[PDB]
């Protein structure tokens, strides 16, 4: 279907913003260990919100990309409005670049003032640093998009893949509405903040990832749709059965009642399951396949994702998910460690996977690329992937050492925040290194076409 | 084991836990007034939650263990700067002297906040510190 071509802009742009995100990472990396680097011009918290919003925005572009591509195939339909795809691409990307420039160009408090955050205050919350108008923008883009891709689904075929992806995206935009709801009570604020961050990332974002993976597995393997979709439903069933009440692992220390310590730990300990079942999913169905796919990079991606997600979200989420363990680890370098490997493993990777599959045919080059462009892509893969595992390694080390020096000893025995940061210095340096190996890795990947 | 029993475990398993979750959030949202001491949550503290948000403290600090990991945990900073009685006065000085300009050291912005704003900010943080976080953090250091 010739209106799958509206996915290209979203994919290209996602990769553009991804280069940004990394660059702003490397800045923060350096700031850790050279405390005045880029100060006052670009303070740490500014570099952070840029690093942080680009990650989320670019993934959202990848997601709309993926949806625009795979949905018409699944519905056996032309995409409802290929123009509205193209116009909603400019609204989103405009509002994207604009809000990123808001951050860099005006002192944050000024940006709150400038954008009239006075009237309807939503700013200065983690991952939610975008002004209230910036958010409004993202909802209209999201509603046009849901309608657009949803109409396509409604006429023509329902497939499990279709429905799940849809349920995922509806769930994403809906929960994003809570980012307009900012209680004056700190705990109430925190309670609801997780309805966005966690129910996205261990909730509805898992259906988006499952369905995308499940689609790619259908095409590159040729294994029966009946079996793929059956597996899919198992994956998401496990995701939500553990995930929903699993929100509780963010509910330990914010001042909601103690029974969450129990509820949160137990339900979280099962949260690795979906990801492990996604490993088995990809390995088993790449294992018994009808065809030999001319693009061997997709199969790499597909596997690396389930593995990385599992390690990052699964294993690393598990290390600190238990209340008596998280009590000491909460808000430390452990957290940044887990945060990185899970975001990269499940989401960056799933996105790069679908781009690996669909970009070649999206440009009219065919099923795959010249064997010269494939070997770069896998050099790209491995570098990023391996750089990231090192990143999270270094950070876990910094983390344990932090919990050791800071959290464990008694008053007077425990090191102060700044003091213990000084001890972590070498890990912070090695992490910059690893970050450089990662940028180089991204560039490699981008040059593979 | 068909696609159907899978799809149904998905539906019912899901719709069950969403209801169980709303039920628990209702129960929890009744608990807060006493847990967080909302009666003592004054206009000052609420006006301070604003200063905290407008300036993105969270972009370098953690509050009750959530935020950035670049600078100290502020949920319990009160206990590190001459306690309850003297904290507002400290914070006034603290905010005015930034950035400290020690070479190589992580630096804090000058936010140019009025005396009034820093006073609300101080009430915010004092209030925050007296929330029942089930005994978090482990010690005086956050």
């Amino acid at each position: 279907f010739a209106s799958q071509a509206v996915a290209k802009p979203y994919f290209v742009f996602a990769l553009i913003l991804f280069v940004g995100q990394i660059l702003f990472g490397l800045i923060m990396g350096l700031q850790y260990v050279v405390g005045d680097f880029l100060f006052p011009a670009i303070p740490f918290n500014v570099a952070r919100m840029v690093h942080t919003n680009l990650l989320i925005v670019w993934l959202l572009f990848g997601f709309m990309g993926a949806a625009y591509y795979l949905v018409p195939e699944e519905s056996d339909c032309e995409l409802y409005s290929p123009k509205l795809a193209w116009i909603l691409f400019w609204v989103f990307a405009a509002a994207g670049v604009l809000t990123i420039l808001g951050y860099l160009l005006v002192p944050y408090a000024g940006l709150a003032r400038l954008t009239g955050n006075e009237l309807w205050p939503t700013m200065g919350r983690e991952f939610l640093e975008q002004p209230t108008i910036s958010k409004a923008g993202i909802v209209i883009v999201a509603l046009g998009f849901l309608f657009n891709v949803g109409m396509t689904v409604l006429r023509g075929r329902k497939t499990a893949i279709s429905m799940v992806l849809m349920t995922g995206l509806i769930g994403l935009a809906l929960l994003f509405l809570f980012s307009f709801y900012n209680p004056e009570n700190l705990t109430r604020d925190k309670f609801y903040w997780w309805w966005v961050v966690h129910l996205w990332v261990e909730g509805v974002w898992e259906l988006i990832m499952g369905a995308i993976l499940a689609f790619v597995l259908v095409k590159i393997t040729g294994v029966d749709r009946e079996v793929i979709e059956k597996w899919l439903y198992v994956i998401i069933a496990m995701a939500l059965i553990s995930g929903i009440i699993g929100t509780g692992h963010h509910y330990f220390w914010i001042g909601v009642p103690g029974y969450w310590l129990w509820l949160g730990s137990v339900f979280s300990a099962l949260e690795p399951l979906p990801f492990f079942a996604m490993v088995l999913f990809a390995f088993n169905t790449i294992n018994r396949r009808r065809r030999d796919y001319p693009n061997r990079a997709v199969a790499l991606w597909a596997m690396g994702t389930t593995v990385m997600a599992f390690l990052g979200a699964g294993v690393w989420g598990f290390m600190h998910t238990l209340a008596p363990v998280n009590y000491y680890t909460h808000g430390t370098q452990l957290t940044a460690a887990h945060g990185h490997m899970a975001f990269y493993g499940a989401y960056a990777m799933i996105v790069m996977t679908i781009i690996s599959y669909a970009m070649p045919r999206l440009r009219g080059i065919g099923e795959a690329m010249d064997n010269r462009s494939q070997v770069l892509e896998m050099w790209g893969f491995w570098l990023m992937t391996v750089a990231m595992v090192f990143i999270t390694l270094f950070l876990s080390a910094a983390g344990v050492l932090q919990v050791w020096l800071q959290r464990m000893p008694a008053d007077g025995a425990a090191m102060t925040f700044m003091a213990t940061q000084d001890q972590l210095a070498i890990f912070y340096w090695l992490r910059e290194g690893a970050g450089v190996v990662f940028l180089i890795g991204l560039v490699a990947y981008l040059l593979s076409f | 084991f068909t696609k159907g029993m899978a799809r149904n475990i998905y539906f019912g398993g899901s719709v069950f836990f969403i209801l169980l979750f709303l039920a628990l959030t209702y129960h929890t949202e009744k608990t807060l007034p006493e847990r967080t001491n909302e009666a003592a949550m004054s206009a000052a503290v609420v006006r301070g939650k604003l200063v905290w948000e407008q300036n993105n403290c969270v972009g370098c600090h953690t509050l009750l263990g959530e935020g950035a990991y670049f600078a100290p945990e502020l949920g319990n900073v009160v206990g590190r700067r001459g306690g309850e009685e003297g904290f507002n006065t400290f914070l006034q000085a603290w905010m005015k002297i930034q950035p400290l300009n020690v070479p190589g050291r992580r630096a804090m912005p000058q936010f140019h906040l009025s005396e009034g704003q820093v006073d609300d900010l101080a009430e915010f943080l004092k209030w925050s510190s007296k929330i029942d976080t089930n005994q978090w953090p482990p010690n005086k250091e956050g």
Partner: antibody, heavy 124, light 108 residues
Framework: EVQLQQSGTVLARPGASVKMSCKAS????????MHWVKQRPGQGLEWIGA????????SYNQKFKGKAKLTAVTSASTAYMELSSLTNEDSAVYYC?????????????????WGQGTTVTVSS | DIQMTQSPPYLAASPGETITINCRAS??????LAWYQEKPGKTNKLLIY???TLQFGIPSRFSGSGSGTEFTLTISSLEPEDFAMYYC?????????FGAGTKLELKR
């Protein structure tokens, strides 16, 4: 309240050793450089050196490199200074003081709290 | 080493007045100078650091400025407890070094 408790007066013969202590309380002892300053009457203060109980590192003024030895015992939040080959020049008041900022990298800063001083009298 | 000269070495004044004292560095210490107050039977008290920053708890009647090699301490309106010994310390380089003092005597 951040407090430093120093040991009492010591008398010694020329060429002997003495070892004085500085007992810290009310802060994280392993997080702050502990500094030692010498004062002889109408002579003005001179910085002897510093220990960092955090990792046990030390830093000496060349003027004192051989004369003084600094150490710390974490468990007891106390730092210690040893003076050797005592001469008359060494008769003086000796202070410990805490760096006013925390961490290993601020080695040369100012101090926010001082001990009351330990008098060393060297005499035959 | 960088060496520090304080001037005057002593100075008389009366409660209510304003005095200003001097501290010169043998070479540039940039902005990093601190001052301490010494009183009998009290531990030494940090007043200002980095040239101009009041340390917590110190009355604002105290203030200080300077950069490079020349610095001053000023007391706006003298108070009985201000008559004391005042030392400056350079916090720019290893090894740390002090001025030899200024004695601020109560005039009668």
């Amino acid at each position: 309240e951040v407090q430093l408790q120093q040991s009492g007066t010591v008398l010694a013969r020329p060429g002997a050793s003495v070892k004085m202590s500085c007992k810290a309380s009310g802060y994280s002892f392993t997080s702050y450089w502990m500094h030692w300053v010498k004062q002889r009457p109408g002579q003005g203060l001179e910085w002897i050196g510093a220990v960092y109980p955090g990792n046990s590192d030390t830093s000496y003024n060349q003027k004192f490199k051989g004369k003084a030895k600094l150490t710390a015992v974490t468990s007891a939040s106390t730092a210690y200074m040893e003076l050797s080959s005592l001469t008359n020049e060494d008769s003086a008041v000796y202070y410990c003081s805490r760096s006013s900022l925390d961490g290993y990298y601020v080695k040369n800063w100012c101090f926010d709290v001082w001990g009351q001083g330990t008098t060393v009298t060297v005499s035959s | 080493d960088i060496q520090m000269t304080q001037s005057p070495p002593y100075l008389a004044a009366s409660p209510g007045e304003t005095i200003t004292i001097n501290c010169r560095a043998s070479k540039s210490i940039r902005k990093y100078l601190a001052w301490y107050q010494e009183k009998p039977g009290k531990t030494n008290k940090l007043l200002i650091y980095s040239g101009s920053t009041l340390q917590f708890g110190i009355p604002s009647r105290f203030s200080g400025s300077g950069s490079g090699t020349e610095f001053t301490l000023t007391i706006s309106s003298l108070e009985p407890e201000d008559f004391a010994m005042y030392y400056c310390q350079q916090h720019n380089e290893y090894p740390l070094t002090f001025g030899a003092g200024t004695k601020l005597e109560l005039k009668r």
